[PDB]
Design a protein around this ligand. Structure first.
Ligand code: K
Ligand code: MG
Ligand code: MG
Ligand code: MG
Ligand code: MG
Ligand code: MG
Ligand code: MG
Ligand code: MG
Ligand code: MG
Ligand code: MG
Ligand code: MG
Ligand code: MG
Ligand code: MG
Ligand code: MG
Ligand code: MG
Lengths: 325, 140, 121, 567, 101, 49, 132, 198
RNA sequence: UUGGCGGUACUUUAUAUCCAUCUAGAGGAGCCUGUUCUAUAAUCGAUAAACCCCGCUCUACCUCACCAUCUCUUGCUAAUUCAGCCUAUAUACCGCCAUCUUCAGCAAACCCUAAAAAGGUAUUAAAGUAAGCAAAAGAAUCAAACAUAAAAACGUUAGGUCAAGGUGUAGCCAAUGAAAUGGGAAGAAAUGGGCUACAUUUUCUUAUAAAAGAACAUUACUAUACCCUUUAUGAAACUAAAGGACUAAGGAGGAUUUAGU
């Protein structure tokens, strides 16, 4: 009562033919695009396939691909025994020959260190590989209990005296922690025809966008869209929003700003200018100050934007009245 | 063909006339499609063809347009439950410059005949000519 | 209208009413109407070389033709016989032997077990 | 810019492995079912036109509209007759012409001539058509010609042409005599029919006949009528009857063609070749050299359709090359076919396959195997799907070049072209492979080929109970199995000699024994003796004695072997 | 055969409005102005009324071309919401996709 | 033109060049219904006189 | 629950193709469009007429090749040319396909007044994406 | 007894890697898995599955491929198409140089779409653009020309824009715009007695 | 011996969540609109949650399916003792959906038991294993995240829809079919939703949401009713918009209830 076909297992003979067909494919794709077959590479292949078979499907897994068989197929679906039927690995009948073969090596290392007999922080800012990464190294499915047990054994190895061989071993299972630098990207300092220094930066609040041009030396003259700021912004709260960047760094009356804000309303345009001024003013302040701006909210774009209306309800969140029952 | 090759392939007859030729200062080609990748391939084909014929070309991407409309999901009643549909239009503008009328016809024919399915073109020729002979001299 | 016509798969699904509120919580039988139809065969009896008749006959390139009213009536009756014969085949069945009683499963042979993993019949 | 794809079938054929024509029959049948489907659509369109009348195409496409061929003018007037003549209805126009005469209404001489044109050209018979012819003394054409009150040159001219077209040579000549007596002047087309008439008629004396045809030409100058290409082509086509005596006359015509200013076409040379290179030529010792001069004259020129025998030239030229066994000339002829668009004049289906078959067959015979294989990949299948004899020629070429390693590949190609079950081809493949010894690697490859050719015999035998395994294939397939590490299979094939009652050859029998000695299996050696006894071959007794010395025979084997020796 | 008798009546209304378009244009022009005598305008008001009622172009209703549904139709395709959704949800309309945003 | 499509496709079904699954389905329901005695009455001979 | 164009789960024995497996919300994401014309692009006309021609062209091809279509056809319009790309099972003899192509091309070229070409890719049997 | 036809092996097997690919795909065609010698795969893959193969792949057939347009073909094509092109006059090396000798700009638009009809209503419109500096206009004429044209004149650019779409065809609308310029220019020079009362 | 069952509590988990907290509303007035009722010669369907500006992103004729009157009988198509039917059954169905629901489950192939009515977990591991669908992931809102959409299986409610279309069974065929003209009315009524107002954080005017000058309780605030003019579409104004006056009620709304992180 089974019609669903067996999950396909790939013989080494099958993958071997898939690699000869791919190798002949590269020579043909190279001949089509007029490139040299010897130097034709995986990057050139992907670019050629995108030109010859343009697909605009959003998901990239569904687009045409001519990749090396090692990539498209799973890495190790090969037979685990020979013609006679004798498995190749002495731990085959465990069902996790690769997980237990690794736990066999690390347990033997631990025993030699304990029998044979400094700071253990040889590597810092590193993490243990996640289960998904481990499963990729072993090429076999692991459970959470199997991963948890593997880490405990690796930790015990670090606790004990470790020669350079052990340190290299544990290194394989340590992945450098991603380094996201939460530090503002300082803008360059250009020079005008007059020779005065000035920096420029963009800012976006709601639908408003601004392009400020702060000058290193000035008397505090801010011009928005070729107008003064008291005229352009008759509301105090809009002017206070322009005061926040300079007042915070005690730099009032020391710079000359030229703004160009298009889009949005009065408050959204002041907010867009505030960010544009804070980002341009970074080039003329110390790095310790740039961090004080970043930590006071002056350098982060505000992500709050109007939410779309939903069909079947009065608003983005407002619902139609629940008729009286 | 390895050994069997045409000897003297016949070529179409191109006869130079005595009429003066058109002079296009600009020639804007706005192609539209639902698929960006098709525009990238067509942009590559068109820019390569222009460069091979000596034409000066520049390319930019006008902002895309998305048209959305709402419909009633059920066949009967159940007003509050709707389904929404959209059509996305993407643009690639090929701005050519300093073209004679013979160069603009052969190029446009070649690229229009190879216009992929689902792609619409909007050529905008800009011709430049002298002033009318009457206007040149004021006559009362 | 030609645009309100649905395929056979959709027509039988509705008529049979197998998937329904009554069926699951508590007879119409399906039939295939393309079983006997040979591409190129119509009620008018036209003969189409290369579709429903030989393209070449005795070295002569055939041309379009139509069967006579008598000949077509024979072909129509012959297909009616084959349909009735096919229906008779459907009715005909091979009865299996009963067990300890006619309405009980005890004693009834159900054949050999299925082949093994390595073609062990 | 683009050239022919050598690995693809002609563009007409559908680009799919299931739909590619394997053989030449499926090629023609596929192009006869397609035409039949087009005719089925045109029948429906022209029979239910109301459904194909809405036009949504701007600009308007005239060729995608329903056709109407039946007259829609009901009134009986000269205008209505003109419509029927335009539609080319022959019987209806005669009825309305007679009705017009019955009323007596005036009919224009030009309109009366358009009626005779239709009747004379179709010879009083309705135009040939498909849907669900000698000249008759009593017919509408001659009757209408007499009823005509006023006659003009065109009227007589139309009769002369229609008569000659429908094989009325004797009458047509008489009609021309009337034209001269009336003092009218004929046109070029009428003079061409008269020349076509004198030739077809059998005159006892050629000298008189030739002087007569010339007299028609002399009257063409008296009446200030200038000849055309067809005029000269007609005279040369007539001369092909008298091969011996038409050689000097034929050349004189071509010299006059250039002086007048008429440019010889491909047809004009097609006729001179026929006259100078007879197919049934006993005197092959010293053939004429004109073919070399003609090709030099036409080198690099491009030709257009200007006669009805232009296609015939290329097929005839290639044939002449094969007769002379000059492959350099064949390259010039094919080179002329490639200049410009000369490829369009190769010929139709009957002559397209003869030209290339003759060409490729000549290549294999007189060309280096390396070059021969280049031509093979280009021409086949793209140009023509060859018949099996072409492969026998290719296999023979490989054998003459000492490159039998490619014979297995040629077999795989043959299966695509519907030669899988060809007895002649299968016998040639196995024969060449097993004709002589080969290195171990080559023998193993041949053994795989022998196994494939065996399956064809086996699968064929399954279909046909009354099947016969030809004797020579059995020997070739068995030898190849022994030589190529398939000895076990060859022992099973030894039994097939008895099943089909084929007499094993002496060479094959001793070969099995040699292999047995190396194996050391006395049992296998005795098996050969069993088959020798069955057919009562004399060598069988000697072979049995040979086994006695080759192997140590057990006492049980001695009794068994002795029984077979007695048998 | 058209979908139903309602689609047939509408089809006739569309072919009779096309026939009388020039007539109803020329006559109605005499009424939509203040430059001609009111006596003529009152008379042209009656010539237009005397024309057949199916010539009037406000009696045309846009119906689904495939199901003859009077309401719910989209004018760009001439299909009802139900029929449009069947072609769209199967990938049969060129460029129409579901709107996710 | 709904008349052109319905008439054209009906004619093609009678020429054997088109197969209408819907029509074949209805043709057999009529055949079975007539055998059951539920067929269409003749005009002018309806149940009510 | 949504019932639109969803081939519902059986018991693991129903062979669905790639096109059938994916529900409407995967259009433009995992599966493309069966018809490609310019009539639904912005500022383009004649969407109604192109769509009506498609509906007919699909019903015509099903009836003209009854039981011989492995998957839905793909319609491609370029200029006034129409191109029909159909996956067809190898059931009918080869010569019969040449007849239906010649017939269906000529008939649809005189009906819509455009050049129409039929492109047939023959499969040994329906291609199964997954068993659901 | 009935014989089922056997499909031939794909012709890609017979294709060399140094073939003339432009010949294989001379013109735009649909993707034929039996003619494209590439192991291309397309389709979202099932869990523990690879993307579907090219043979019987509807997704690859749904793609508007560019196999007929390859860098080798495009270069070979344009080599033939060079004879058609004509050389732009070298003297007109700048935009300002063109305005000097050719002050009038005529805009014409074409539209390419898919369908049986090649007709688009928008193709009739024409637009003439000339700068008043290019026209020989006295101080009186320029003031009269600017008042008559109204908003057609742009003070910032000094460009007069005449848009003519009333006529059915493009050749009629083009000739009308040239006519409108001639009357406006000639009328502007004419002086009427009522003009002295401004 | 399984399942069911509770009006079962305690402990966690979350919920614009029962209650509590917060903001603007509904419930009062005037209108717009759906429904019920009354009622008409005069449709139909939805009508607890999951109906009530619902099918309608829409009814002056048309639309139209209703009522009255008159009229046609092979009556759209190539053919058909046939065409046609918004005739009955959504409790025969397809199609397309609602509801639990962004809830976490549904289904199949094997293996095991001193027999199995069933069950099959122990991680320092004791008989379970390996594939599916949903969730998840991925994609979309054109950097990034978050969020929002989309997605959401099997079942539950014989839930909704024979009137989108198609269709099983039963029924009409000089009529339950076709067509034309004219009508399809109202309410001292109840009720759902929406709109506007009840004002001083207000009203009018210029600017523009900055500021300024006036108004500010009897009609000051305040009529999207009625009535009267004019314009728009149309053949038809019975419709919509803009003015004009006329102006009544309304003074922030009992229990109770809706939405929002
Ligand atoms: K249902
Ligand atoms: Mg709100
Ligand atoms: Mg019994
Ligand atoms: Mg209306
Ligand atoms: Mg009404
Ligand atoms: Mg009415
Ligand atoms: Mg009714
Ligand atoms: Mg129900
Ligand atoms: Mg109900
Ligand atoms: Mg995403
Ligand atoms: Mg998800
Ligand atoms: Mg119910
Ligand atoms: Mg009735
Ligand atoms: Mg204010
Ligand atoms: Mg009015």
């Amino acid at each position: 009562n089974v019609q669903a076909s067996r999950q396909e297992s790939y013989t080494e003979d099958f993958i071997k033919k898939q690699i000869e067909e791919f190798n002949i494919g590269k020579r043909h794709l190279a001949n089509m695009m007029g490139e040299d077959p010897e130097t034709f590479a995986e990057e050139d292949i992907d670019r050629a396939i995108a030109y010859l078979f343009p697909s605009g499907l959003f998901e990239k897994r569904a687009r045409p691909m001519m990749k090396h068989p090692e990539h498209i197929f799973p890495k190790q679906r090969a037979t685990q025994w020979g013609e006679d039927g004798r498995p190749f690995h002495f731990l085959f009948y465990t069902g996790k020959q690769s997980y237990y073969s690794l736990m066999h090596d690390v347990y033997g290392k631990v025993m030699q260190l304990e029998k044979h007999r400094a700071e253990s922080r040889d590597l810092i800012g590193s993490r243990w590989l996640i289960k998904e990464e481990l499963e990729e190294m072993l090429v076999e499915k692991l459970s959470d209990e199997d991963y948890a047990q593997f880490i405990r054994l690796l930790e015990k190895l670090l606790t004990l005296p470790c020669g350079p061989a052990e340190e290299e071993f544990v290194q394989r299972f340590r992945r450098s922690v991603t380094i996201q630098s939460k530090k503002q990207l300082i803008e360059p300092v250009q020079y005008d025809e007059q020779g005065m220094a000035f920096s420029t930066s963009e800012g976006r609040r709601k639908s408003a966008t601004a392009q400020a041009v702060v000058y290193e030396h000035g008397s505090g003259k801010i011009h928005v869209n070729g107008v003064d700021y008291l005229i352009y912004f008759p509301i105090t709260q809009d002017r206070e929003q322009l005061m926040f960047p300079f007042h915070f760094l005690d730099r009032l009356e020391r710079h000359d700003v030229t703004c160009t804000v298009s889009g949005g309303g009065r408050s959204a345009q002041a907010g867009a200018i505030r960010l544009a001024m804070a980002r341009a003013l970074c080039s003329f302040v110390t790095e310790d100050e740039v961090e004080w701006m970043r930590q006071a909210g002056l350098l982060t774009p505000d992500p709050r934007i109007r939410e779309r209306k939903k069909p079947g309800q009065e608003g983005a969140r407002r619902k139609f009245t629940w008729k009286k029952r | 063909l390895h050994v069997d090759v045409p000897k003297d392939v016949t070529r179409p007859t191109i006869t130079t006339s005595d009429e003066p030729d058109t002079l296009y200062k600009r020639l804007s080609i706005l192609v539209k499609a639902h698929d960006r990748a098709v525009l990238d391939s067509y942009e590559y084909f068109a820019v390569l063809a222009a460069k091979e014929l000596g034409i000066s070309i520049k390319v930019h991407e006008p902002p895309r347009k998305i048209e959305r409309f709402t419909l009633l999901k059920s066949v009967h009643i159940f007003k509050k439950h709707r389904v929404q549909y959209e059509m996305r239009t993407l643009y690639r503008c090929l701005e050519l410059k300093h073209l004679t009328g013979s160069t603009a016809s052969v190029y446009l024919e070649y690229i229009q005949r190879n216009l992929p399915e689902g792609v619409a073109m909007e050529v905008t020729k800009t011709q430049i000519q002298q002033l009318p002979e009457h206007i040149k001299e004021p006559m009362w | 209208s030609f645009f309100t016509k649905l395929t056979a798969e959709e027509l039988w699904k509705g008529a049979l009413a197998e998937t329904g509120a009554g069926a699951r919580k508590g007879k119409k039988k399906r039939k295939d109407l393309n079983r006997g139809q040979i591409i190129g065969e119509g009620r008018s009896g036209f003969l189409w070389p290369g579709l429903n008749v030989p393209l070449i006959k005795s070295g002569v390139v055939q041309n379009i033709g139509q069967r006579s009213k008598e000949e077509q009536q024979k072909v129509e009756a012959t297909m009616v016989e084959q349909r009735e014969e096919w229906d008779r085949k459907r009715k005909i069945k091979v009865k299996r032997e009963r067990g300890w009683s006619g309405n009980t499963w005890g004693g009834v042979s159900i054949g050999p077990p299925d082949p093994g993993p390595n073609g062990e019949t | 810019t683009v050239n022919r794809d050598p690995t693809a079938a002609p563009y007409v054929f559908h680009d799919d492995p299931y739909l590619i024509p394997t053989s030449a029959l499926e090629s023609r049948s596929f192009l006869l079912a397609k035409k039949s489907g087009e005719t089925a659509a045109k029948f429906i369109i022209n029979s239910y036109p109301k459904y194909f009348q809405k036009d949504i195409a701007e600009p308007h496409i005239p060729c995608l509209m329903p056709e109407y061929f039946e007259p829609q003018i009901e009134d009986v007037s000269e205008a209505a007759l003109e419509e029927r003549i335009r539609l080319r209805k022959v019987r209806a126009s005669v009825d309305m012409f007679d009705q017009l005469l019955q009323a007596g209404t005036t009919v224009s001489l030009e309109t009366t001539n358009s009626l005779l044109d239709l009747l004379c050209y179709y010879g009083d018979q309705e135009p040939p058509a498909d849907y669900p012819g000698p000249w008759k003394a009593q017919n509408n054409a001659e009757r209408i010609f007499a009823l005509m009150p006023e006659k003009n040159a065109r009227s007589y001219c139309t009769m002369i042409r229609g008569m000659v077209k429908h094989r009325a040579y004797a009458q047509a000549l008489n009609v021309y005599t009337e034209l001269l007596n009336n003092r009218l002047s004929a046109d070029v087309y009428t003079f061409n029919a008269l020349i076509e008439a004198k030739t077809f008629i059998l005159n006892e004396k050629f000298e008189e006949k030739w002087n007569d045809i010339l007299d028609l030409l002399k009257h063409m100058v008296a009446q200030k009528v200038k000849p055309n290409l067809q005029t000269f082509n007609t005279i040369l086509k007539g001369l092909r009857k008298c091969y011996s005596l038409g050689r000097i006359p034929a050349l004189q015509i071509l010299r006059e063609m250039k002086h007048i200013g008429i440019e010889p076409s491909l047809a004009t040379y097609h006729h001179i070749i026929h006259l100078f290179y007879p197919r049934d030529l006993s005197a092959i010792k010293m053939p004429s050299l004109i073919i070399y001069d003609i090709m030099n004259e036409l080198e690099g020129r491009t030709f257009s359709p200007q006669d009805l025998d232009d296609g015939r030239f290329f097929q005839l030229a290639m044939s002449v090359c094969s007769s002379l066994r000059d492959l350099e000339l064949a390259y010039q002829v094919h080179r002329l076919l490639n200049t410009g668009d000369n490829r369009k004049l190769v010929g139709h289906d009957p002559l397209r396959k003869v030209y290339y078959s003759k060409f490729f067959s000549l290549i294999c015979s007189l060309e280096q195997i390396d070059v021969t294989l280049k031509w093979y990949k280009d021409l086949i299948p793209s140009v023509f799907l060859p018949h099996y004899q072409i492969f026998i020629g290719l296999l023979q070429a490989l054998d003459v070049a000492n490159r039998l390693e490619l014979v297995p590949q040629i077999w795989k190609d043959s299966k695509e072209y519907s030669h899988t079950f060809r007895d002649a081809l299968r016998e040639e493949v196995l024969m060449l492979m097993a004709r002589d010894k080969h290195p171990p690697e080559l023998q193993v490859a041949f053994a795989d080929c022998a196994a494939d050719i065996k399956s064809t015999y086996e699968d064929q035998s399954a279909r046909q109970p009354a099947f016969d395994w030809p004797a020579n294939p059995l020997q070739y397939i068995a030898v190849l199995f022994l030589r190529g590490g398939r000895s076990q299979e060859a022992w099973k094939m030894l039994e097939l000699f008895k099943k089909h009652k084929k007499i094993p050859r002496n060479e094959l029998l001793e070969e099995f024994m040699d292999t047995a000695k190396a194996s050391g299996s006395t049992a296998l050696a005795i098996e050969v003796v069993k088959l020798a006894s069955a057919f009562s071959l004399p060598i069988g007794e000697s072979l049995a004695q040979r086994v006695v010395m080759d192997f140590t025979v057990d006492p049980e084997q001695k009794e068994a072997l002795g029984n077979l020796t007695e048998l | 055969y058209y979908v139903d008798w309602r689609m047939l009546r509408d089809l006739k209304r569309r072919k009779m409005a096309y026939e009388y378009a020039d007539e109803r244009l020329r006559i109605n022009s005499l009424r939509k102005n203040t430059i001609l005598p009111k006596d003529l305008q009152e008379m042209a008001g009656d010539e237009i009324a005397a024309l057949p009622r199916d010539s009037c172009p406000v009696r045309i209703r846009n119906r689904c071309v495939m199901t003859s549904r009077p309401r719910g139709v989209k004018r760009r395709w001439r299909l009802s919401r139900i029929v449009f959704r069947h072609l769209a949800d199967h990938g049969l309309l060129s460029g129409v996709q579901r709107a996710i945003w | 033109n709904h008349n052109t499509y319905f008439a054209l496709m009906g004619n093609l079904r009678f020429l054997g060049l088109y197969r209408d699954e819907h029509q074949d389905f209805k043709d057999e329901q009529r055949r079975l219904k007539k055998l059951r005695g539920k067929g269409k009455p003749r005009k002018g001979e309806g149940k009510r006189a | 629950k949504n019932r639109a164009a969803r081939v519902r789960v059986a018991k693991g024995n129903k062979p669905v193709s790639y096109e059938e497996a994916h529900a409407p919300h995967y259009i433009a994401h995992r599966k493309g469009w069966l018809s490609l014309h310019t009539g639904n692009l912005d500022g383009e006309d004649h969407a109604a007429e192109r769509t009506l021609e498609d509906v007919f062209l699909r019903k015509f091809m099903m009836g003209t090749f009854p039981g011989c279509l492995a998957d839905q056809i793909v319609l491609k319009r370029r200029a006034n040319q129409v191109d029909i790309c159909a996956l067809v099972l190898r059931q009918l003899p080869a010569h019969k396909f040449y007849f239906l192509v010649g017939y269906s091309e000529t008939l649809l070229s005189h009906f819509y007044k455009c050049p129409v070409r039929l492109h047939l890719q023959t499969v040994p049997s329906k291609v199964v994406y997954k068993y659901i | 007894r009935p014989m089922r036809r056997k499909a031939l092996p794909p012709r890609t097997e017979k294709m060399d890697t140094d073939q003339d690919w432009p010949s294989v795909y001379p013109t735009a065609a649909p993707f034929k898995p039996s003619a494209v010698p590439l192991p291309v795969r397309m389709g979202y893959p099932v869990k523990k599955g690879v993307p579907m193969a090219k043979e019987g792949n509807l997704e690859l057939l749904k793609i508007p491929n560019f196999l007929h347009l390859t860098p080798v073909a495009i270069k070979r094509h344009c080599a033939a198409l060079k004879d058609f092109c004509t050389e732009w006059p070298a003297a007109l090396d700048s935009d300002e140089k063109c305005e000097e000798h050719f002050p009038v700009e005529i805009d014409t638009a074409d539209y390419v779409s898919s369908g049986p009809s090649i007709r688009n209503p928008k193709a009739r419109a024409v637009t003439l653009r000339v700068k008043l500096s290019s026209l020989n206009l006295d101080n009186h004429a320029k003031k009269k020309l600017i008042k008559l044209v109204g908003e057609r004149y742009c003070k910032a650019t000094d460009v007069l824009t005449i848009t003519t779409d009333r006529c059915p065809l493009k050749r009629q609308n083009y000739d009308y715009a040239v006519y409108l310029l001639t009357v406006l220019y000639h009328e502007s020079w004419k002086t009427e007695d009522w003009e002295n009362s401004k």
